[PDB]
UniProtKB/Swiss-Prot annotation, chains A, B, C:
It comes from Oryctolagus cuniculus (Rabbit). L-serine binds at N58, R94, H452. The modification Phosphothreonine is found at T29, T183. PANTHER family: PYRUVATE KINASE. Its cofactor is Mg(2+); K(+). Substrate binds at R61, K258, G283, D284, T316. GO terms for molecular function: ATP binding; magnesium ion binding; mRNA binding; potassium ion binding; protein tyrosine kinase activity; pyruvate kinase activity. Beta-D-fructose 1,6-bisphosphate binds at T420, E421, S422, G423, R424, S425, W470, R477, R504, P505, G506, S507, G508, F509. This is Pyruvate kinase PKM. The lineage of its organism: Eukaryota, Metazoa, Chordata, Craniata, Vertebrata.
Amino acid sequence: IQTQQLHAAMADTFLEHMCRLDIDSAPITARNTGIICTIGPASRSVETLKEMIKSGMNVARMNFSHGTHEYHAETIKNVRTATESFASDPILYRPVAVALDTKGPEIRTGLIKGSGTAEVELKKGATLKITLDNAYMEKCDENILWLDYKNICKVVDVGSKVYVDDGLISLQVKQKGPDFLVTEVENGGFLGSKKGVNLPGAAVDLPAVSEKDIQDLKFGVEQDVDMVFASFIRKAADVHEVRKILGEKGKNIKIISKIENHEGVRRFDEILEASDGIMVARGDLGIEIPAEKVFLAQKMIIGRCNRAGKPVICATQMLESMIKKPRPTRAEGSDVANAVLDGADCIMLSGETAKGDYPLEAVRMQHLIAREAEAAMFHRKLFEELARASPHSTDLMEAMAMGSVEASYKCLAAALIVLTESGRSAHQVARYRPRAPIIAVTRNHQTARQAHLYRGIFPVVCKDPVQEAWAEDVDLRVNLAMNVGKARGFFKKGDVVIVLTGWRPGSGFTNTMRVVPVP
Amino acid sequence: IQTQQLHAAMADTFLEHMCRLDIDSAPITARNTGIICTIGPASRSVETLKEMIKSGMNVARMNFSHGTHEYHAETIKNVRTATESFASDPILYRPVAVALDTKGPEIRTGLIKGSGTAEVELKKGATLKITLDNAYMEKCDENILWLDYKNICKVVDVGSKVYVDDGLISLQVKQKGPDFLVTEVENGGFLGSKKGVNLPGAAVDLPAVSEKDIQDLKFGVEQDVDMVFASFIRKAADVHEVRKILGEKGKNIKIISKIENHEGVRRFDEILEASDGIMVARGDLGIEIPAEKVFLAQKMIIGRCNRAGKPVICATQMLESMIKKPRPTRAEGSDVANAVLDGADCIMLSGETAKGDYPLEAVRMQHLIAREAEAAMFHRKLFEELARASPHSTDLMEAMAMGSVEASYKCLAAALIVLTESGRSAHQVARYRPRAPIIAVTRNHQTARQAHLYRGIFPVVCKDPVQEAWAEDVDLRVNLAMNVGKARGFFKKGDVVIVLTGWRPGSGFTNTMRVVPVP
Amino acid sequence: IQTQQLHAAMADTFLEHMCRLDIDSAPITARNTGIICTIGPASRSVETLKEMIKSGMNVARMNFSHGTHEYHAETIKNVRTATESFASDPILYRPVAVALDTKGPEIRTGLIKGSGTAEVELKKGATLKITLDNAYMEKCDENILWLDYKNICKVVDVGSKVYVDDGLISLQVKQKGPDFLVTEVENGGFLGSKKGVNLPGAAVDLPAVSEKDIQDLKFGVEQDVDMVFASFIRKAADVHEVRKILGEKGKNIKIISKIENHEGVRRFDEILEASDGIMVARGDLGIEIPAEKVFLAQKMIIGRCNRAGKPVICATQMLESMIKKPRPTRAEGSDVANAVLDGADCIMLSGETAKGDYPLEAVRMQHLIAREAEAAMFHRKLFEELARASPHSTDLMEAMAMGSVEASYKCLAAALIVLTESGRSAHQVARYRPRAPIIAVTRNHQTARQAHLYRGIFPVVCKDPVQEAWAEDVDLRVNLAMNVGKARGFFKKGDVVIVLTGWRPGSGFTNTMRVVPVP
Ligand SMILES: [K+]
Ligand SMILES: [K+]
Ligand SMILES: [K+]
Ligand SMILES: [Mn+2]
Ligand SMILES: [Mn+2]
Ligand SMILES: [Mn+2]
């Protein structure tokens, strides 16, 4: 029989835990891993968004690497419209967050000359001249290649390698002429317009926060986005610049630093301290450093974020092949599962959702794999190691959290209900990775939206006004969670859930926990 | 500084181990994970095979789902030709195994318009008719489809699902008429000729070993293949049938059962006992059972095989996208890494090698990821577990093996040298997963070839005749290993390696171990 | 069924390990814990010594706190006579070590006055005056008590507590007059002659090595003792002074620092570095510092010594009550068991052997408890933890040790045979605590005698001359071990043992191990 890999949960070793994984051990209804969907022409329509939400989407990511403000404003407007089309039912309403992915220090090449083939082919052992002559800005070809990085020449050297499109195409500088570069094509073949360019071994002096960026972040504040995915941040200083720009009015916007180059990996510790969360941007990371090493950086990053208690996102190409096909490849399914097992708080879709033919099938697939992997976690082991690395604490919530999660493990609670406004308490509970869903009730619409960044936290926005008597106000928000839970099939009348509340309205966190029957 | 994730090797927890993975901790030269390549039109040429070998190929897999005997006979002949082109040098000669992959109980739709390239769409609602009438055999079109499985009507029901062409296409039986099925198209769109068919929730009664299979196995014995990849085996009886056909003359051919359907996963334990090894055929497995659960089956299978000490292979779509591209996707790189970390003895390529545009790049990539992940393993923990999970033990080689690997850990030996003929002693040493390469010297050309099925065993065929004095014959095979090692850059004069030999010529295994300087 | 707590050895937790200890799981014949017997009037007779040996004695301790040199010389002569009375049989001969226990900076009282033997009573709340006037030297009573510590007035002050006769009697300095001390009796009652005195809260300026000491050590060198138990050593410097006096001629005499005061416990680390071994002298230690804290110091000491690989002895009052009774108390039995379980290499008897009515019964009891507790160890857990404290940093012989011990666990070897002259190789094997007996064959009579200091090493002196051929000389010393083992009931023809030898005569340690049948 058994359910949600409970037999394997009892194992005393990882080897036995693995040997006990059962494909016939049904996972639970609730899904703990937040799904982040990148919105594009394939999913901008309010009607598709509505389905995006029912299928699982928690975070709508706007990639400011392309598109104008009015563009992104309309799409932001549509996700909100689709979201609120549900607001009518307080029990079935699923909050949805809006994220903003910075363009950052990108290098991009121009448009191929119209006058000639659709795409130019850089054949191995062929010459190619890279120029900055704005004249060739839209007249690229097998001979001339224009880039949008002016100082490029001062940071590269003879012998330096240049990667272009998703470092599918490789170039080697042979002559470093003043204001231009004569190179030789090593790899790749076909080149299109506006393609990504990477200088792995160089020190790109572009700004962390460029003019263009400053305006986009400002725009986010204006548009009231919940988070910011800062691209190519390579040190604490960068995070701080982004923090400063968001300034006072955007103080509450959570900054998620994207790690996508050797520098950022090397200075990860100081970056994590300055950020609210981290994103393993495997795409550029896999170009900036050898592809075979990404898995190392991913696990290291997810590991340290877990230990720190800050959200971490795994992104890029997870279900890549589903851009053109309805079902994922065996490796891609594996990729998602291992990301969840590695400890990732959220998994992302960018392309499979932005411009793919199967956006809805893709999020549904991550949703399926998520629940399955989440159950295959070795909680007993993870908890212990995670509490070990928990320094001596003068913060009582950490204790409440560990006690509660432990309590949830013992009575196989159906869920952990947490009343919070800043979201802190719930964040703490999620940190110690309980198996059961963390139903966080709050009146702060934003902390609800931001809650998705945390593994296990199921945000529930309470719209009822604050009751006179604190006890009644509590039983109110608690019953709301109870109902949402019954509605979502997380638990029925008679199951056990642990409830974390504040003893008195003035309590600075959840200092009260109870084991309670759902009825 | 550090090398081969040794700093992270010292951690006491998995969380710390992960937090310590360093992308600047260079792996070692030696690669322990065997690479199995599926040979096809893109890699049959002797010249390509030569490069296949230099790039890392250890096992050539002939997929008998297609091709005639003379076809596979020539390709087998070519891999041997390319292999022997190296025989001349005893030190740099890498033996290559030949593997035969069985067709088994497959279900294939017939031809379309009696033509190779096929058309016809389908998509939702579109009713489709599945006839068994061998008349319209080679006349499949948009409305009537023919299957090569005759009893298909007795094993399926109304409402049953039928997957066509790698589960991309989905049908649902609406009317189960006698000798034909009227179905409705759920998923899928375009169907070609002779495409695979799967009946997920049905009990297919086809024969474990068919008439077609019997001749192919017989042929394998004739061609002297080292192993058989028994497709779709679902129980011990199945393995035994294959064992019987190979019979006495093929007694030494190792049988690798392929697990690719619910039944096989369910009866896995008895199948493992009857087999010499196991292959996680995620392809059909991901169709036969929900895709999201494959990762569960994989980890469970790899785990149990490790515990049992029999070789286990992970296969299908690992570097899939590389069939059309020079670099893999981030998910695919991750998939290989986790396969090695899960503990798979060999990883496979089938298509990326058989008919892709980048066969060489693909094996080279697995080779790269393999070494990287092999170092990222948590040996201390693994060993302890493999040990604390090795019930009983009277096979002294177990003792010798565990003590030697433990000794190799302590003095960070560069390699373990094992003299063996049946290969048993080396198998035992690999079982306990040393970090260093296992250089197994043997005069039994076949055990050398078969050795690749084991993680870490680097086979070396000794051609020198047996010396008069046992001591000299030993020091001879040992120096050959010493030389092979120095040549392959596994170690230089002065490094330490542990040597496992037999005290006297009559010893039944490796009962003598030594810590020795390589010089 | 089961034997030697092997069922409990399979447990994965200490709690389970304990819950599985079975009083019906017969321990093995061999005893790994060395037994150190203090020789006195109750056991100086050669005839008693002979029985002391057959009963289990490994080390004869001569306590130079009393007796003249001619006295100790005769007793040393008798143990040697009793020991050699067995030398005739090379197989049944058990070497015995002679240990010299230093007097050190002791503080003794004088002889009660001549009254009718009537010992003196010190009722609570009485005065009593301690003088130094060498006139009361043999005339102590209720009013005056002489001390042999001349500078006692300069180290104590008013309020200072003074303990007499094994801390049984308590006195508090009320008036610190010049050259005397007026005190008040807190505890204690009856005072005899020449009793022990402790100033726990003072800084005794007596010489670590006194005039009396230097001569005694010199004598030890002359008498060729195997080890020295240096009393009250409180710092590295102390150990060095002793090392220096033993000088060049006594360079091979192992120095065992005795930890018996707060200072020694506080500076333990530097003392252990300088010593060859350590003795937890609970006697004075339990006076110098609170009684309830000794168990902490013992475990800590035994712990760090284990971690360092140096012999550690537990001593004093273990079977105390047996001085007058044939059977030990329940606490004493427990005390011996827990000492073996703590990890003590040797357990001592001093009094129960020196002047008790049941010297033989006492050593026999320690012998019985030892084997019983040695089986009740949690080897799996202990080993894993020792290996951790021994990083991957290598000397090389410890690789062999760890590998060998691991191998002995796996095939449940009957014993580990080690050929060594300096004894080093065996010491290393013992360090990693195997379950089976370590039969160490040597031609160095002394290293054999000293070997007893190490848990599990069963010394065997080889008298045969060195064979021409290194191979024959090895099989010779191995067969001797094989024979000794069969004789002692350690193992019969057909059992498995691991043999650690040197490949070539020049090897600097045991670099060759083998799993071999005993026959
Ligand atoms: K971007
Ligand atoms: K096949
Ligand atoms: K003494
Ligand atoms: Mn990027
Ligand atoms: Mn298949
Ligand atoms: Mn003492």
